[PDB]
Design an enzyme around this catalytic site. Sequence first.
Site, mmCIF file in Angstrom:
data_model
loop_
_atom_site.group_PDB
_atom_site.id
_atom_site.type_symbol
_atom_site.label_atom_id
_atom_site.label_comp_id
_atom_site.label_asym_id
_atom_site.label_seq_id
_atom_site.Cartn_x
_atom_site.Cartn_y
_atom_site.Cartn_z
ATOM 1 N N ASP A 47 -33.782 39.030 -20.195
ATOM 2 C CA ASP A 47 -35.010 38.955 -20.762
ATOM 3 C C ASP A 47 -34.784 40.072 -21.656
ATOM 4 O OD1 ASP A 47 -37.554 38.967 -21.677
ATOM 5 O OD2 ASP A 47 -38.459 38.835 -19.787
ATOM 6 N N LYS A 77 -42.680 41.482 -30.478
ATOM 7 C CA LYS A 77 -42.790 43.017 -30.432
ATOM 8 C C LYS A 77 -42.233 43.851 -31.413
ATOM 9 C CE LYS A 77 -44.179 41.652 -25.837
ATOM 10 N NZ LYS A 77 -43.367 41.302 -24.514
HETATM 11 C C1 LIG Z 1 -43.408 39.834 -24.211
HETATM 12 C C2 LIG Z 1 -42.348 39.420 -23.258
HETATM 13 C C3 LIG Z 1 -41.543 38.083 -23.390
HETATM 14 C C4 LIG Z 1 -41.771 37.172 -24.398
HETATM 15 O O1 LIG Z 1 -43.083 37.287 -25.102
HETATM 16 P P1 LIG Z 1 -43.142 36.113 -26.229
HETATM 17 O O2 LIG Z 1 -44.659 36.524 -26.702
HETATM 18 O O3 LIG Z 1 -43.171 34.887 -25.696
HETATM 19 O O4 LIG Z 1 -42.195 36.342 -27.320
HETATM 20 C C5 LIG Z 1 -40.795 38.051 -22.287
HETATM 21 N N1 LIG Z 1 -40.561 38.927 -21.322
HETATM 22 C C6 LIG Z 1 -40.976 40.269 -21.088
HETATM 23 C C7 LIG Z 1 -40.981 41.058 -20.011
HETATM 24 C C8 LIG Z 1 -42.190 40.479 -22.143
HETATM 25 O O5 LIG Z 1 -42.614 41.680 -22.423
HETATM 26 O O1 LIG Z 2 -48.340 43.217 -21.536
HETATM 27 C C1 LIG Z 2 -47.332 42.465 -21.329
HETATM 28 O O2 LIG Z 2 -46.888 42.192 -20.228
HETATM 29 C C2 LIG Z 2 -46.770 42.139 -22.516
HETATM 30 C C3 LIG Z 2 -47.796 40.857 -22.997
HETATM 31 C C4 LIG Z 2 -46.857 39.498 -23.185
HETATM 32 C C5 LIG Z 2 -47.658 38.204 -22.824
HETATM 33 C C6 LIG Z 2 -48.880 38.254 -22.078
HETATM 34 C C7 LIG Z 2 -49.516 36.780 -21.811
HETATM 35 C C8 LIG Z 2 -48.228 36.034 -22.641
HETATM 36 S S1 LIG Z 2 -47.212 36.711 -23.351
#
Ligand SMILES: *Cc1c(COP(=O)(O)O)cnc(C)c1O
Ligand SMILES: O=C(O)CCCc1cccs1
Lengths: 394, 388
Positions: free
Chosen positions: A208, A243
């Site tokens: 991930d 991000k």
């Molecule tokens: C943000 C996040 C994702 C994926 O976010 P998407 O908004 O679907 O791009 C996946 N794993 C972790 C740990 C994250 O913080």
């Molecule tokens: O705060 C976090 O864990 C990252 C936010 C990413 C997301 C929250 C809900 C759907 S994707």
Amino acid sequence: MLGNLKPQAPDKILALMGEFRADPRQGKIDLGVGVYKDATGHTPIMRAVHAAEQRMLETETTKTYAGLSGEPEFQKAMGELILGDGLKSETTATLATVGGTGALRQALELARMANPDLRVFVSDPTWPNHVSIMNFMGLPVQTYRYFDAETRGVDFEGMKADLAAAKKGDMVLLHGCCHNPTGANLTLDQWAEIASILEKTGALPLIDLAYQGFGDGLEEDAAGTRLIASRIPEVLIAASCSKNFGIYRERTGCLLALCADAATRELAQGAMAFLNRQTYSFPPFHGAKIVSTVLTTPELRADWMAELEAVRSGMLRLREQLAGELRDLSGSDRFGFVAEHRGMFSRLGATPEQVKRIKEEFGIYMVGDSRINIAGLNDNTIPILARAIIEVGV
Amino acid sequence: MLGNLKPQAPDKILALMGEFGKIDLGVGVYKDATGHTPIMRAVHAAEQRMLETETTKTYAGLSGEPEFQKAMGELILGDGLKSETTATLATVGGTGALRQALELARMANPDLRVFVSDPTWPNHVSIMNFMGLPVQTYRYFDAETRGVDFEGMKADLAAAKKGDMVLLHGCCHNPTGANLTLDQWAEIASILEKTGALPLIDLAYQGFGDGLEEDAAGTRLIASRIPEVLIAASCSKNFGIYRERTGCLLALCADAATRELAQGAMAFLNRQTYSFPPFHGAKIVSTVLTTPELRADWMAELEAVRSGMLRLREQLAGELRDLSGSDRFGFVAEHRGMFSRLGATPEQVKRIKEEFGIYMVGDSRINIAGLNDNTIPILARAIIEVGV
Ligand SMILES: *Cc1c(COP(=O)(O)O)cnc(C)c1O
Ligand SMILES: O=C(O)CCCc1cccs1
Ligand SMILES: *Cc1c(COP(=O)(O)O)cnc(C)c1O
Ligand SMILES: O=C(O)CCCc1cccs1
């Protein structure tokens, strides 16, 4: 018929935001945010990104259906950004997904498709969405020790012991960098050892990677992933662009499947494309086109990397400060981990009771597991948080 | 482990384009006189406005934005929109809306069967096969008259049971081009009501048949009679934003209590699939629909496309009668939408593609938008030469 539907639990983010919003306190602080926020409390559109959208607006002549598994420009640019020179195109399958979450869901569907008796090993703790999706899919889940509540670091010996129980065909979910929610990460040497355990067990690694460029740097953050790729024959990587590109709502990510042979690759690509097809036909184009534009255009890419590094450097300095303020007030090291952690998140190690006491007495809000967002801190809020942490007795 | 993967069957319709003087009458996308799929004026203007107004790209609504959800519900149901009992969910195109529709229904009824039209969009059966859902078909196309076999349809639909799902194309039936009249829709509503079958309406070409409002006539009739109904809408074709992937699922319930249930389960479905739905395309749609000037130009542009294709159909029938004097191919004029199924068999179809260079879907489905003043005579000749 629909009345027979079972009540599904809300997003929770709302409940946190609702509680916080209700708070009449003039000086309340919100460290529960899960996105990046600058000094003024905004989540700006990166310069390079806004430049890509202007260019797209001037060049796109049509919006007809495009590539089912993504556009070649995006797949190529993403694999290079992640695997670098180590990109073995001959054995790599790629899939444009709806955000990193889409990539995770597809990866799970792929693995299970290849091995029905798939078991998933997740860290303790991990991003709740991991477990949510897996439970929803009805896949068996095992946990492996990871966060050490006492040192706020990685309980590596514990992780090794638990990972040693994986069997051939199982899946091991690893955060490539900036562990969410802990902020405690693996060293390159710990990665090497994990790699050995994986070769030994025959377990399939699922990485991930949603924060490349937020830890130690673009290249540095992919080091662990690259080590796994070069030593393990089959690797699944779920990447996000939400991000490190600041295009959260565009829903841009991709699944990378590293295979042992070219034949196996042709198989994987066919199954991935088929998956997209059976879920929503074609993946969203806009966000992915922004990314491939930034990465392929020298000017933009240079500006993106510079802006991203500015962000990383900023948060790191916020870490130095908070740890310093905590050093002064405590008169001890104790909280040194704050400066050692990487990513925009950190678990303080506070119990739920302490978290509630911090909110009630100091108006500071964070996730119940004591997760705070570094980006939400600043020259004015750091002294307050420090004092609160010490006052509640963490 | 990945070596265990079995090879999967390709999407025939999309594979068609793979083998592409050359006349493409395959993939269901609109094309102008010069064989291009342009971007609509309002759409382009919306993007420019969007470029100046958006200040952030943070995570937003899990079920889509209120503006999008409202604009879509109004567009589809008009004044028949009882927001108190309607649940909305932004999705990844109409296909996404479809998948979520089947998942939702399956959560509500683990013992559900799906009735689909003979014939129907191939992607309907593939998705159902993938999910492992039992599929029954109901007669719809009359092979000889190229119209609807209504008596056969009624008979088959009556065999349905409470809990079963009936999939109806709201308008512009893909791949036949044959469509039900409003009087036939009322009868269908009768059968559904009696049987207690939940109808799922696939609405992908609203605006390509007889008009924006007119094409939603059938859907509005069912929505006004049947207490519970699912509608999967695509904005891919009527907005010309195919690649943006935008559509939505509407869940009409008998009351707000059940509505809150569906709404909760719908959101949950997005969360566990890809978290948030794609914002760009949905923003363009809502921008166009809530900006009177934009909405006005979009309606006008869609109208133009509509009447243009209508003319092409007339040209086809005409030219073809000059080559027979018979009203055999008259159905071309009756069919409404982007597609029309000729009575050609696979062998004939192949002869056409090989000794005529014109590529159409293997079942005689042709995209009238692909024809033009220059190719109509040629195609007219082609199907005459091949004798169909
Ligand atoms: C943000 C996040 C994702 C994926 O976010 P998407 O908004 O679907 O791009 C996946 N794993 C972790 C740990 C994250 O913080
Ligand atoms: O705060 C976090 O864990 C990252 C936010 C990413 C997301 C929250 C809900 C759907 S994707
Ligand atoms: C176009 C179409 C859809 C959905 O298309 P999306 O590109 O997924 O928006 C669904 N059903 C039919 C019959 C269609 O022609
Ligand atoms: O041509 C058609 O039948 C519809 C448009 C093309 C598509 C195939 C799969 C999803 S959209």
